[PDB]
């Protein structure tokens, strides 16, 4: 967790290789291992990241030096410092050189060229281009840099009008109108950038973050969206995010969805926000799942695989969460077993029976602890999430194949398991089943058992008692009710739900030593209180005169000062 100690260890291990003066293959690989353990743990900001790339380049490991640069681009979007270095290197390269050097240049140009501080990147590619004798290629980069609102735009314009002595103004009109339109936008953008340039100052405050002006800058680049916008708001988000904030991601995704680019761009941004964002946020993630469900209708096959790998990755990190299991299972029933109404009915019924067969072999396989990693459902079952698979099997057996005998056999089998005897959708499905058949014997035996031997959350027990009283009043007569009354439990389905609501532990039918007496006036604090053994205060004074009164017997006279406390808090949580 200690990012400072992870910063300190790499700062200490590098200083052990550097000051022992050896190659130090232990500490060289240890500083590399400390780099790998850090970079997997922390997003590795580019200024810190560059030293790792500089040392590996100093250790001449060319193939590995390229690969750490790709990771750096993912870690920081505004990494023009890492972009230029990756463009400065890989020019000292082999035969694939000329194609790779422009490939990294154009990839950065789609990554960083819309930034105000991007003047060094185009110049370096121009430096690479001027070193070649492709003056046509130098000219193409000149016109593109003219058209984008950059810092030294006027400096670039005049310089390109003197170095290009051979072909300066082949189209005067085209170049200058693009330059002045760039100057109109950069004059506009100068308001926000100078409002940003006068707030960013590291004082461990909100001004170093510039979040107010970054929310101002992102807002004013959203509305005047002259189609550079999607690249610009990407560039605007990139400088604003680098300064973890998921709400900025949600605003960028909302704007980009409103802008209607192709969806695979949005999927790339969603995967990046899935990757670099910390776990437990739980709000952009389900947004990603419902976007994958909504866009499933347009293109079929690849979105099932994006969905499937997403739901597997999200039961990696939130195993206690159950909406993912039923959501996966809804998508499995839609995609893998699909059959419209227009198809002949034996096909339909066989797809339903195939679904029941795979689902039953899945839960029967997992209870008896044998796993089958070829089928993805076998991997996805967790014991918190087993119950919703059993529910899907019940609801499909009963409502689709429509046999009540097999359904009752599954209820009578699975309610004895450990993992699902205290599950909510299993028992509430059981309630809807024994409500569908209108019998009251199983319902009275169910809600008579609902606190003692079927432990449900009190909100669900209150809902079940309220709806069962409402159901019984309208679906049952007095001849059934008066024969339903049995006296050893004093159970009566009209009034017993009205008493059993808020207290679950309710038994329907030596007092001085119970734990309700001892802590009477004050809960939790137990004191044996002094009392007279044979008190006469219930006896009237019309009957005390008939025979003389005995002396009082006392109990607990030693304990008028002793009060004792079972402090669960301190023992089990402060001192562990």
């Amino acid at each position: 967790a200690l990012r400072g100690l992870d910063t300190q260890f790499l700062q200490d291990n590098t200083a052990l290789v550097q000051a022992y003066r050896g190659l130090d293959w232990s500490d060289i690989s240890s500083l590399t291992q400390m780099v790998d353990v850090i970079e997997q743990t922390v997003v590795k900001y580019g200024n810190p990241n560059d030293s790792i790339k500089l040392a590996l380049e100093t250790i001449l490991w060319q193939i590995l030096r390229k690969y750490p640069l790709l990771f750096g681009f993912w870690k920081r979007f505004a990494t023009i410092e890492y972009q230029l270095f990756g463009l400065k290197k890989s020019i000292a390269v082999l035969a694939t050189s000329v194609k790779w050097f422009p490939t990294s240049l154009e990839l950065w140009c789609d990554y960083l060229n819309v930034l105000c501080v991007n003047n060094p990147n185009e110049t370096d590619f121009i430096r690479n281009n001027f070193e070649i004798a492709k003056d046509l290629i130098g000219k193409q980069f000149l016109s593109h840099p003219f058209w984008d609102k950059f810092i030294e735009f006027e400096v670039g314009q005049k310089n390109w009008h003197n170095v290009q002595r051979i072909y300066e103004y082949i189209i005067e009109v085209p170049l200058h109108q693009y330059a002045r339109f760039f100057t109109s936008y950069k004059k506009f953008l100068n308001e926000k950038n100078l409002k940003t340039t006068r707030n960013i100052d590291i004082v461990l405050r909100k001004t170093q973050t510039t979040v107010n002006e970054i929310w101002q800058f992102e807002s004013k680049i959203k509305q005047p969206f002259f189609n550079l916008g999607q690249v610009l708001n990407d560039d605007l988000e990139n400088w604003s995010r680098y300064l973890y904030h998921e709400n900025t991601w949600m605003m960028y995704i909302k704007w980009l969805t409103k802008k209607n680019i192709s969806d695979e761009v949005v999927v790339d941004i969603y995967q990046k926000a899935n990757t670099f964002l910390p776990l437990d946020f739980k709000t952009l993630r389900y947004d990603f799942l419902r976007f994958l469900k909504r866009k499933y209708r347009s293109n079929n096959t690849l979105f099932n695989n994006i969905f499937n790998e997403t739901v597997s990755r999200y039961l990696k990190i939130w195993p206690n969460d159950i909406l993912l299991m039923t959501e996966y299972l809804c998508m499995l029933k839609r995609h893998s077993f699909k059959n419209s109404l227009d198809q002949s009915p034996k096909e339909i019924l066989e797809k339903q029976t195939s679904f029941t067969k795979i689902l039953e072999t899945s839960i029967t396989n997992y209870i008896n602890n044998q796993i089958d990693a070829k089928v993805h459902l076998q991997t996805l079952i967790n014991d918190k999430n087993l119950s919703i698979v059993v529910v899907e099997l019940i609801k499909t057996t009963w409502l689709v194949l429509k046999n009540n005998m097999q359904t009752r056999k599954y209820f009578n089998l699975y309610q004895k398991n450990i993992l699902i005897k205290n599950s909510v959708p299993f028992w509430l499905t059981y309630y809807k089943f024994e409500k569908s058949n209108v019998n009251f014997t199983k319902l009275n035996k169910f809600i008579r058992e609902l606190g003692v031997e079927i432990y449900l959350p009190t909100t669900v027990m209150n809902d079940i008692l309220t709806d069962y009283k409402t159901f019984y009043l309208t679906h049952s007569n007095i001849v059934t009710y008066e024969s339903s009354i049995i006296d050893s439990n004093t159970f009566d389905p009209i009034l017993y739900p009205e008493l059993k609501m808020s207290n679950p532990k309710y038994d329907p039918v030596d007092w001085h030593k119970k734990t309700e007496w001892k802590e009477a006036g004050h809960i939790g604090i137990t004191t044996e209180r002094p009392q007279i053994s044979n008190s006469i205060i219930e006896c009237n004074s019309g009957t005390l005169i008939q025979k003389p009164i005995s002396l009082p017997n006392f109990r607990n006279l030693e304990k008028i000062n002793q009060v004792k406390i079972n402090d669960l808090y301190t023992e089990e949580f402060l001192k562990e």
């Binding site: 159950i322 299991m325 959708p425 009190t458 609501m501 808020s502 808090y569």
Partner: protein, 267 residues
């Protein structure tokens, strides 16, 4: 011993500074000097007490200042100090931990399964009363629930004691917040004081609120006593209680039944 001498018949223009000057630095260094002035008029009543540390110092002051001329008079330095059946009681104080605080309304739920979420734990403890927060630590196998009312929290400890949440008998008791727990943990690793602070009061008389009451979501209510007028919103702010509480409540529980049976809320 805090021996006190009662000087009297003092001159009007004699100060507590001069009364200190005539009592301290002669025969003693007296701990205090206090002339009784008039409570609204300020003019000295002509008598005042002085408090010496030692009883020998006061009596040495007593024998020598008896009759001694102080600012025009003789200042009468008699000692100030040294049968009803019924008196009011008086008692010590229990030093204010989390048990002996009468405003402590946050339950410590201990012994959890660790397979229980926060929403599933909110579903247990919610119908006892409205609830400010339900945060639980990551893997300490114990939680924390805090109610608005002391009455609802006591009802929760009575009703839910020893009930099994995901097959483990639960351990309910009192226990402080997250801030106070971090404070006690750092001041216990430094083991300096570990003293606690009383939870805030409702600044009563409060008239709208009927405690242990829940409402889940234009108002012209007649504000009569039997109804409820104000309430705490569920997470938080204060809402004027509408007319239609039962319709919204019953409608949300039919929603909760039909969605929970199919699997969209495990709570």
């Amino acid at each position: 011993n805090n021996c006190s001498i009662f000087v009297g018949d003092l001159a009007p223009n004699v100060t507590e500074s001069q009364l200190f000057e005539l009592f301290i630095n002669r025969y003693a260094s007296t701990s205090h000097a206090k002339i009784v002035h008039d409570q609204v008029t300020g003019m000295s009543k002509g008598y005042g007490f002085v408090k010496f540390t030692n009883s020998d110092e006061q009596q040495l002051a007593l024998s020598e200042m008896q009759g001694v001329f102080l600012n025009g008079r003789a200042i009468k330095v008699g000692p100030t100090s040294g049968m009803s059946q019924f008196i009011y009681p008086v008692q010590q104080q229990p030093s204010l931990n989390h048990f002996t605080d009468p405003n402590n309304t946050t339950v410590f739920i201990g012994g959890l399964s660790s397979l229980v979420t926060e929403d599933e734990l909110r579903a247990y403890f919610q119908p006892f009363g409205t609830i400010v927060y339900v945060k639980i630590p990551v893997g300490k196998c114990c939680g924390f629930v805090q109610y608005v009312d002391r009455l609802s929290a006591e009802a929760a400890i009575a009703g839910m004691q020893g009930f099994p949440i995901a097959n483990s008998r639960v351990r309910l008791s009192w226990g402080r917040s997250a801030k106070q727990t971090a404070l006690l943990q750092q001041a216990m690793l430094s083991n300096s004081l570990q003293v606690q602070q009383q939870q805030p009061g409702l600044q009563q008389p409060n008239y709208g609120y009927i405690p242990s009451s829940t409402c889940e979501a234009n108002v012209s209510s007649t504000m009569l006593p039997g109804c409820q007028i104000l309430n705490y919103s569920n997470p938080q702010q204060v809402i004027m209680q509408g007319s239609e509480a039962v319709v919204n409540s019953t409608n949300a529980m039919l929603n909760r039944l039909e969605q929970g049976s199919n699997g969209f809320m495990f709570a």
